[PDB]
Amino acid sequence: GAMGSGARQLSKLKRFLTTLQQFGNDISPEIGERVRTLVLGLVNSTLTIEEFHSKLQEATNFPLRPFVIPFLKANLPLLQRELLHCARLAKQNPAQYLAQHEQ
């Protein structure tokens, strides 16, 4: 095999998010922030599939296919691993935490 298959899932994740993002882009100027924070959170290792999907239901309305939440779990390795490379270039202080929630 080759080294760099994590690029595949990003296709569905980057695409999927674009749909649910608008599903709630009419609640308030903060949902637009929520959806954005949810995705950056799930990738920043500060969130989770079960949480992201569970929480996004409010801002983006994730309650759709009963098998939608599990998909992200299968493709997560790609989005996390592939994105980890570029993330390494930044490596800031996540300890800051701007949102800070209970989850």
């Binding site: 569905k12 749909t19 098998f67 939608v68 998909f71």
Partner: peptide, 18 residues
């Protein structure tokens, strides 16, 4: 089916079974 399969295989369910 096709067309945004990645978006359909995860989003929407009633619009297809209704």
């Amino acid at each position: 089916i096709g067309t945004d399969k990645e978006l359909s295989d995860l989003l929407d369910f009633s619009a297809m079974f209704s």
